[PDB]
Structure 1
Amino acid sequence: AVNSKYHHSCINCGGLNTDERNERGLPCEVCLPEDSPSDIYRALLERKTLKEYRFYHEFWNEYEDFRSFFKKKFGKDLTGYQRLWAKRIVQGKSFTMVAPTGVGKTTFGMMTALWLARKGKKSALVFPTVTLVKQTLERLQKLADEKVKIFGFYSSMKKEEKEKFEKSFEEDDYHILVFSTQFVSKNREKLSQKRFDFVFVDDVDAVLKASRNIDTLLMMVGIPEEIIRKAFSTIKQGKIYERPKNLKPGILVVSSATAKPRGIRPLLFRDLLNFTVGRLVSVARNITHVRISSRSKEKLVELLEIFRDGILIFAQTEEEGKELYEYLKRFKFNVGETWSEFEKNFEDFKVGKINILIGVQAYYGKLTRGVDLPERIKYVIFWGTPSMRFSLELDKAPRFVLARVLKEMGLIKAQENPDVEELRKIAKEHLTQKEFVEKVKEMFRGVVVKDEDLELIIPDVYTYIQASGRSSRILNGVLVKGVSVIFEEDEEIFESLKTRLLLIAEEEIIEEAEANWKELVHEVEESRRRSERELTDTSRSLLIIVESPTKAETLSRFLGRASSRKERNIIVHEAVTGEGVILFTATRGHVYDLVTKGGIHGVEEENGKFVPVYNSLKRCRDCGYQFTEDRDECPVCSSKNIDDKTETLRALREISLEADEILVATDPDVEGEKISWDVTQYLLPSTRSLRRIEMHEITRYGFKKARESVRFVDFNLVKAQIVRRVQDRWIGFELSGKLQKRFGRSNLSAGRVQSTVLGWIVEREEEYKKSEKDFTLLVLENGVNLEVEGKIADDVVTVVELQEAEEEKNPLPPYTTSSALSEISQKLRLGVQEVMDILQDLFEKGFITYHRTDSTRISLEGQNVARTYLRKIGKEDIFMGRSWSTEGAHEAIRPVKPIDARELEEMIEEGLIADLTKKHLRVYELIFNRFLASQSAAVKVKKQIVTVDVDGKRMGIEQIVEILRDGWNLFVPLTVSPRFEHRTYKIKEKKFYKKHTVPLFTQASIVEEMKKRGIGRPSTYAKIVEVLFRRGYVYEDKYKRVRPTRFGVMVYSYLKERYEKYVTEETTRRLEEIMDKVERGEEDYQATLRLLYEEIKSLMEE
């Protein structure tokens, strides 16, 4: 711990407790004065302070009984899925049963109903078919005692049982009632007037067939139609609805939606039960994609002879399907078809009578609308790449083509245009077919433009993913292996497909050379027989906490957002993986912050040591004002509509009970570690299993490698966060006050660094007007222009000595935060803050590596990205992998995927990925080009060093002339220059002037400078500049230079006159150095706090 206080962190009294106690999962000293108590519950009860801890005790005890009961009545222990479901059941929570192929939902439903009836609770079990009612009641009756009132209802019911069920359901206080969905639909009013504690729905689709059934099931727990209709109007509007806090419903449990959850009705579950009826979108895949260069049926024969069994062939059309079918039939292979004898061959393949199934892209995907046996399909063969083909003529042209063409050409003025109308609009404007196809070849990058036969081929990645997916799912807790083979000869098509597969599924396609068929077939078969074995369960549930919503969204993109529980302030998503379930949620920033209330501006002092005091953050959803103090309304606009991180914290504490293991996935910096600690410390009394993961990339790889890096919270980083925060708080407050008494305004000084930088700008104004040195520009005859010192008047330049040398020029290292901000904000006409934000969205959308780095280091994987991209662009001989740095916390800002900006624009306009502005694309382009240059070969150049005499001055001039051999100059331009000959060049034009030696600052120049001086860190750079702008201390002019205002000058003048020590660059740098030493556990936390205090105490007197 760091010995600090958190305001609502007590597990029992719900109040203030120290970091150190929560760490030991203890209540506050008020609740329990003792150091190391014997047993918490017992001791709380003894001191008569037992309050909220009871909930947890009773929770644990009410669950461990369930588990115990289940382990007694049934075979063995609970599966991970059933474990999480059980923990949700004792909380009375309603949910979908998110899980793979037959994890035993019916077993859980039964044992739940049984365990509840054991207490006196009444439950109902709903099934689609009338046969399932029979089978379930059968299994129930033999395990249930006489104490349990069991009834049933279905089609083939008896003559006295049908009425027995009705009278008993009317008065006789039943326990468990097993019936069909038909009964629900038919006897709506009867059930609606009854109250159930537990309702188990086996098939959600059958019950969602009617709209009436939603209201029926909702009224089966005790919810009036008033709340239902009000919520209905709210969901008809387009916003969320709030359940009355005074409501205690039963437990509704359903399975995953097979078909799409169509309609408005399911939203009632989102407000009344806080669970969404999700569809099973399982992205869990273990497929090996191999590509064969030729559509040779001989290769196909050889492959088929290796695979032998359970092969699925996909043809583009049925014609090539029939052709392939004939060729294989002739070569004596047990084969089937989908076009002729669909059902017969389908089931014959299902059983094993057929080894090879040949289908079409559109035929199979629609015939298999029912079953689709996964335990049979090991290998998927693609006879050609699945793709969408369009014609490139002035006629036969699709909408999106003429759209992207005319929008760029200039015609598209936005008024929605009919296709044939657009054809007739382009029929006059740059109209030839030749001109057209050329505009298409020029615009469309990341598709295949067959300009030969006038065609456009767009590989259907989705279809490939689904179809390939048919060879790998989760069976008996085992994610079985599958091989997907593609037979493609067109390199352009294969490359396009590969890029969009890497983009969406992050899955690679390998070549036939780098693939051992014997080994692969073996892995497949072995995993299959491993799943055939008797399962002993390894599945666990896992909670992953991140700070920003974007991270959660892109995480859901590769984990698959099946269902989303709305828990107070947050939205926790759930996903199915091969290792078990996986819950992930976003905090939506910081939770705690230093209190302004007491001690030394929030920092208290006891026993010679400093104690930081934190309180939950509150943000008014109206005006946007943030505060720490506990108030009912907004201190500014007096509004009650606020966001309280204490609710978020409570929500986390709730979720933490269901999860077996927890991982905090905040950013890999001091900020992130501090948040991670504010969270882990708070949760620590609730869950014993809490660890830390640092994701440098927001992708499956970043995540896997992040979990390789699993560790506990590093207190040195937390300590460093604290120190920096305390410095800004103390110095900021003191200086700001001193300014309140001089310039009227309250909040003015954000810290020391800010004032230092502003000082740089202010005095720069002075030293700029003084650098005014007289100069002269010279346009030389059939040569370059030369910039030389003022007084020249000879009109002739003589060449004195001339020497040339061959040299290989190295590219610039990859972007770091400083580099990226400077170059990008210079090349673009943007502020460093705008750039920093674009970078943040870029990292958070998993497109680049961590954007807050002071290292240029590049891993073998980064180098590999560069390599594959170069191999893709054909210029792979120019690849030169460079680590760039050994000393590195993180890597430099680089792309995560070998995809350029143009291809991304294509994927965006196409609709594969979304949410990227033009600015994002341009920034990405800059990062990309920098990185590749840094990974491309050294450009071999012949440069000359010309010594020239101009007006009795021997002045050398070094210039590159010939580029002997290309390299990184393809990404980042390399400028040549006309050769000088050892003669006399005459001056054409002399443009005399006086431009300044020391130029003004630009935002880029300021960042560069503070990086050059050792002031600020990667996180603070842009924020510092922006603060300077927000406070009105600085402005930008015509040519976008940074200039101080009247106010800024007044302020820095005051601060320099009086408080020069606390604004001096030497002091700022010395402190920056020391704090950074604290971050590495090289300098003492409490000691530097003592230092900052000792200078603050000195400042309170001046």
Structure 2
Amino acid sequence: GKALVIVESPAKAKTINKYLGSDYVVKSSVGHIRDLPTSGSKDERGALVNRMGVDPWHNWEAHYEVLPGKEKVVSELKQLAEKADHIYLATDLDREGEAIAWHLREVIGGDDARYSRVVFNEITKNAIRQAFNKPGELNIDRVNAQQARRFMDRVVGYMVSPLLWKKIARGLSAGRVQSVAVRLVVEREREIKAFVPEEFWEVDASTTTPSGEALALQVTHQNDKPFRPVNKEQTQAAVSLLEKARYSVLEREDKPTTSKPGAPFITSTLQQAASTRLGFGVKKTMMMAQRLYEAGYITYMRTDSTNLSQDAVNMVRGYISDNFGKKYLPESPNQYASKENSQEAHEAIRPSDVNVMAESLKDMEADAQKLYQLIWRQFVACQMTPAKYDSTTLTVGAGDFRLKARGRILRFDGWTKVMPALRKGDEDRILPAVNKGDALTLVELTPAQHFTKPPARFSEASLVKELEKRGIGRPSTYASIISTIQDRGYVRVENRRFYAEKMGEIVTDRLEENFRELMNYDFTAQMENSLDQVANHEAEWKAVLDHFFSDFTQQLDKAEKDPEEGGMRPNQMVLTSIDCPTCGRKMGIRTASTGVFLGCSGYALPPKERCKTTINLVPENEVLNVLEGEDAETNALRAKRRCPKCGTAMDSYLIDPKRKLHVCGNNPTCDGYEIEEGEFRIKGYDGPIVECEKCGSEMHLKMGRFGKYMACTNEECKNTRKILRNGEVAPPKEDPVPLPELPCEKSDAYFVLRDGAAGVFLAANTFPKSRETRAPLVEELYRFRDRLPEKLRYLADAPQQDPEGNKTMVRFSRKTKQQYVSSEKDGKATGWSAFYVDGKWVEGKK
């Protein structure tokens, strides 16, 4: 017989075909085939329930639908199911996969015994074999939980968005967890803008040992009180007093220290680590993680369990025993404890085969290889022996002052070998072995000025960590929350940090005022826990949906009323002394979904006296300096003015090339505004921004007779790139290089080397006439290595012949957008290829 396996991604289809075989047929059902309506294709209540699809009053009838373009796939799947005998639903582990499987089952038919739900955490031979050995039944409870979540989201969105349109502004949106995330960001922004940085100085001293060794220490006490000078004069006086005094090392301290490795990656930890080390965002991290999982190299990327299988434990222990040695084993496995509410049935994010190094991933892009290296290193480290340091602490007294120094020396690098630190820390230095009660000689000292840091702005990783802490969201939803808070125009991300737009503040204030139950963190956490209980078959989904809908309806009917009755307050106006170009009247500051702008009061007047003239603003972007490190945020807060009526800082906008505007942070609650005059270069540009590889200047998008292209703004540089079908911009095509020594074979012309998105190729010099092209050989490139531009020279370094001695050719991998070298025999590929991974060429069988 023939059994049908339905999977979601075509890549998953290929990888699972890599282990199922000829007996089975695998079909890729791209995405969700059945979903609630999206487009438009007591009558108000009927219209609302038709728009939502769900009818909460009538026991939550669903009215699912098949989106356009899915009909062909539905027909193909139905035909294959008629052909097949047993249908296998092999979607992913999470609730989303169960929902997809339930949708497929409902579409195809013949429910009772024709379907088997396959559960595998990694696409590998053993895992697939065990998964297909005893297939499981479709878990209806998890499907119900997913549907409950979707219904809650749709109800809130389609029942709040009209309210926000009526009261605040058209074009708004709302979401149950999206609103809570925006609230977190807005609260952090308010804490930051309320912060008034203090100032404090510090003193560093240089000393030389009687043995001649050097030491650097930091002064920490004065008069047995903490040393924290406020003003420069006090700092100079302290420095003078320190110089006058005599120094002696009155305290010596030593202590062994141990550092244990980190736990294996759960999804939140993986995102944090990717952001901190490789700089990836959450979207890129999860996309590459999904690619790695589908290709079969890593386990499922949506998890909250640090548990590891016995097979994985034995594999990694064997790898450590074979490669590193017994000093790194250690005697017993390293256990890590996850949350009691976590999906302990799942594993962590680990490699599917420890011996596959990151360089060997031929079919994964460079970023994917880096992510896999991170996962592999974490997995190896999690079972290695703790690293050992010895720490030295020195305290030196001089007059009324005391100064301190601390350092550590590493002696065993068991877990730090595979997972090295990004940079050396302040304590990663060598303090000389001074004696107890020793003496020191002095060198010139250095003062320093600092300002107390404000609370750190949310990074994507940090926001995800906060959400994990509060219980808001789940592993399968973090990326959705992060993407949706940005797409909906309430919060932007710049400098790899979260910034709150004013519209976000307005919507957050209104939602807190009217829907206090929905926006509370504890209630959101309780709702998530209730969904989890439903998944565990601890509660009935319709019951909790009804409870939430009852509370939400009460709150909504309360909120829809007039502001005097207690409804949602409108977008109040802050008036300022500016002349309206149409009627010279004073102009207010308003916020729409587009941004923050200047309007005229005439907008509030009837058409007889109405004024629609508006002034568009351009906010000033904060440019944090990466070199300033931790200071980058602090200096930013120091750059802003301060509102006169309150200590809250103010945000800057430009109104004229001569005039700039400052708006209070609590606008429109606080009406403080300021106007400044000066020479201001208006940005005057919008749209794509590219960096010119020829001069490093900004490159902009332009349109002409040939469509759309990209040209550099530098008047001295006319470099132009082009837009292609499925990319932001074409790669930096290099200048063609002629080769008179390579003759054509079908004609009398000579070959010329050209570059492009297709790759690097050889073409006839009379291209419109000869039209003869062939790929270059590595030996051919080595023959004319000198003429090759600086970039392409690496191709000449690639191995010229395979282990079988056959000749190699330069090819372009479009799936990874990179050049490799492959050998061919008798015109067929020998299956040997070498790629360029981090400055070296790695070769292997294809």
TM-score of the pair, normalised by structure 2: 0.55
Which string of whole-angstrom CA distances, capped at 9 and with x for unpartnered residues, describes residues 220-243 of structure 1? Answer: xxxxxxxxxxxxxxxxxxxxxxxx
* Letter aligned with residue 9 of structure 2: S
Which string of whole-angstrom CA distances, capped at 9 and with x for unpartnered residues, describes residues 98-119 of structure 1? Answer: xxxxxxxxxxxxxxxxxxxxxx
1:1035 is paired with a residue whose SS is strand
* Letter aligned with residue 993 of structure 1: H
1:74-93 mapped onto 2 (5 Å cutoff)? 80=1
User: Offset of 1:1020 from its aligned partner?
Assistant: 1.4
In structure 2, distance between residues paired with 1:556 and 1:856: 29
1:1088-1099 mapped onto 2 (5 Å cutoff)? 1088-1099=544-555
Q: In the alignment, what sits opposite 1:591?
A: 33
Change (3 A) 1:780 1:717: farther
1:862-941 mapped onto 2 (5 Å cutoff)? 862-871=312-321, 873-875=323-325, 877-880=327-330, 881-885=333-337, 888-899=344-355, 901-904=357-360, 908=362, 914=363, 916-941=364-389
Q: In the alignment, what sits opposite 1:53?
A: none
User: Offset of 1:824 from its aligned partner?
Assistant: 0.3
1:943 is paired with a residue whose SS is strand
Give the alignment partner of residue 132 of structure 2, picking from 707, 713, 718.
707
Q: In the alignment, what sits opposite 2:144?
A: 719
Tell whether 2:492 aligns with 1:1035. yes
In structure 1, distance between residues paired with 2:300 and 2:468: 18
Change (3 A) 1:756 1:780: farther
Change (3 A) 1:902 1:698: closer
In structure 2, distance between residues paired with 1:733 and 1:740: 11
Contact in 1 for aligned 2:7/2:26 (Cα 8 Å): yes
User: Offset of 1:871 from its aligned partner?
Assistant: 4.9
Tell whether 2:241 aligns with 1:803. no
Which string of whole-angstrom CA distances, capped at 9 and with x for unpartnered residues, describes residues 16-39 of structure 1? Answer: xxxxxxxxxxxxxxxxxxxxxxxx
Change (3 A) 1:862 1:948: farther
Q: In the alignment, what sits opposite 2:483?
A: 1026
In structure 2, distance between residues paired with 1:1091 and 1:787: 61
* Letter aligned with residue 153 of structure 2: D
Which string of whole-angstrom CA distances, capped at 9 and with x for unpartnered residues, describes residues 74-96 of structure 1? Answer: xxxxxx3xxxxxxxxxxxxxxxx
In structure 1, distance between residues paired with 2:380 and 2:306: 13
Change (3 A) 1:735 1:988: farther
Change (3 A) 1:1052 1:893: same
Contact in 1 for aligned 2:358/2:370 (Cα 8 Å): no
Contact in 2 for aligned 1:684/1:690 (Cα 8 Å): no
Change (3 A) 1:544 1:764: same
* Letter aligned with residue 1002 of structure 1: S
1:687-706 mapped onto 2 (5 Å cutoff)? 688-706=113-131
User: Offset of 1:713 from its aligned partner?
Assistant: 1.3
* Letter aligned with residue 191 of structure 2: E
1:1036 is paired with a residue whose SS is strand
Tell whether 2:534 aligns with 1:1078. yes
2:551 is paired with a residue whose SS is helix
The more displaced of 966-975 and 721-730 is: 966-975
1:29-178 mapped onto 2 (5 Å cutoff)? 80=1
Q: CA RMSD in A?
A: 3.1
Change (3 A) 1:592 1:871: same
Which string of whole-angstrom CA distances, capped at 9 and with x for unpartnered residues, describes residues 116-163 of structure 1? Answer: xxxxxxxxxxxxxxxxxxxxxxxxxxxxxxxxxxxxxxxxxxxxxxxx
Give the alignment partner of residue 978 of structure 1, picking from 430, 435, 457.
430
Q: In the alignment, what sits opposite 1:841?
A: 291
Q: In the alignment, what sits opposite 1:1054?
A: 510
Contact in 2 for aligned 1:653/1:686 (Cα 8 Å): no
In structure 2, distance between residues paired with 1:899 and 1:950: 58
User: Offset of 1:1082 from its aligned partner?
Assistant: 1.9
Which string of whole-angstrom CA distances, capped at 9 and with x for unpartnered residues, describes residues 913-940 of structure 1? Answer: x2x2111111111111111111211112
Q: In the alignment, what sits opposite 1:993?
A: 450
In structure 1, distance between residues paired with 2:165 and 2:336: 49
1:272-291 mapped onto 2 (5 Å cutoff)? none
In structure 2, distance between residues paired with 1:858 and 1:799: 50
Which string of whole-angstrom CA distances, capped at 9 and with x for unpartnered residues, describes residues 432-467 of structure 1? Answer: xxxxxxxxxxxxxxxxxxxxxxxxxxxxxxxxxxxx
Tell whether 2:405 aligns with 1:967. no
2:15 is paired with a residue whose SS is helix
- Count of residue correspondences: 507
User: Offset of 1:877 from its aligned partner?
Assistant: 4.5
In structure 1, distance between residues paired with 2:325 and 2:398: 44
Tell whether 2:64 aligns with 1:603. no
2:60 is paired with a residue whose SS is strand
Which string of whole-angstrom CA distances, capped at 9 and with x for unpartnered residues, describes residues 184-228 of structure 1? Answer: xxxxxxxxxxxxxxxxxxxxxxxxxxxxxxxxxxxxxxxxxxxxx
Q: In the alignment, what sits opposite 1:25?
A: none
In structure 2, distance between residues paired with 1:757 and 1:693: 35
2:293 is paired with a residue whose SS is helix
Contact in 2 for aligned 1:868/1:898 (Cα 8 Å): no
In structure 1, distance between residues paired with 2:249 and 2:182: 47
In structure 2, the gaps of 5 or more residues are 39-46, 207-213, 221-226, 560-846
1:572-721 mapped onto 2 (5 Å cutoff)? 575-576=21-22, 581-595=23-37, 599=49, 601-604=52-55, 609-618=59-68, 643-644=69-70, 646-685=71-110, 688-708=113-133, 710-721=135-146
In structure 2, distance between residues paired with 1:1047 and 1:970: 48
User: Offset of 1:1026 from its aligned partner?
Assistant: 1.6
Q: In the alignment, what sits opposite 1:376?
A: none
Q: In the alignment, what sits opposite 1:547?
A: 8
Which string of whole-angstrom CA distances, capped at 9 and with x for unpartnered residues, describes residues 859-904 of structure 1? Answer: 1222233234435644465234334348622111111122465532
1:1100 is paired with a residue whose SS is helix
* Letter aligned with residue 543 of structure 1: L
Contact in 1 for aligned 2:288/2:367 (Cα 8 Å): yes
User: Offset of 1:605 from its aligned partner?
Assistant: 5.0
Larger Rg: 1
Contact in 2 for aligned 1:656/1:687 (Cα 8 Å): no
1:992 is paired with a residue whose SS is strand
* Letter aligned with residue 717 of structure 1: R
Give the alignment partner of residue 756 of structure 1, picking from 180, 202, 205.
180
In structure 1, the gaps of 5 or more residues are 1-79, 81-540, 560-574, 619-642, 909-913
TM-score of the pair, normalised by structure 1: 0.43
Which string of whole-angstrom CA distances, capped at 9 and with x for unpartnered residues, describes residues 267-318 of structure 1? Answer: xxxxxxxxxxxxxxxxxxxxxxxxxxxxxxxxxxxxxxxxxxxxxxxxxxxx
User: Offset of 1:647 from its aligned partner?
Assistant: 3.7
User: Offset of 1:973 from its aligned partner?
Assistant: 2.4
Instruction: Identify the structure with the greater strand proportion.
Output: 2
In structure 1, distance between residues paired with 2:457 and 2:532: 30
1:812-831 mapped onto 2 (5 Å cutoff)? 812-831=262-281
In structure 2, distance between residues paired with 1:1083 and 1:1093: 16
1:1024 is paired with a residue whose SS is helix
Change (3 A) 1:862 1:876: farther
* Letter aligned with residue 182 of structure 2: L
Q: In the alignment, what sits opposite 1:636?
A: none
In structure 2, distance between residues paired with 1:582 and 1:695: 17
Change (3 A) 1:956 1:546: farther
Which string of whole-angstrom CA distances, capped at 9 and with x for unpartnered residues, describes residues 232-260 of structure 1? Answer: xxxxxxxxxxxxxxxxxxxxxxxxxxxxx
Q: In the alignment, what sits opposite 1:144?
A: none
* Letter aligned with residue 651 of structure 1: E
Contact in 1 for aligned 2:534/2:541 (Cα 8 Å): yes
In structure 2, distance between residues paired with 1:818 and 1:697: 19
Contact in 1 for aligned 2:303/2:346 (Cα 8 Å): yes
Q: In the alignment, what sits opposite 2:160?
A: 735
* Letter aligned with residue 177 of structure 2: V
Which string of whole-angstrom CA distances, capped at 9 and with x for unpartnered residues, describes residues 617-676 of structure 1? Answer: 33xxxxxxxxxxxxxxxxxxxxxxxx12x4433332322233232221111111111111
Q: In the alignment, what sits opposite 1:791?
A: 229
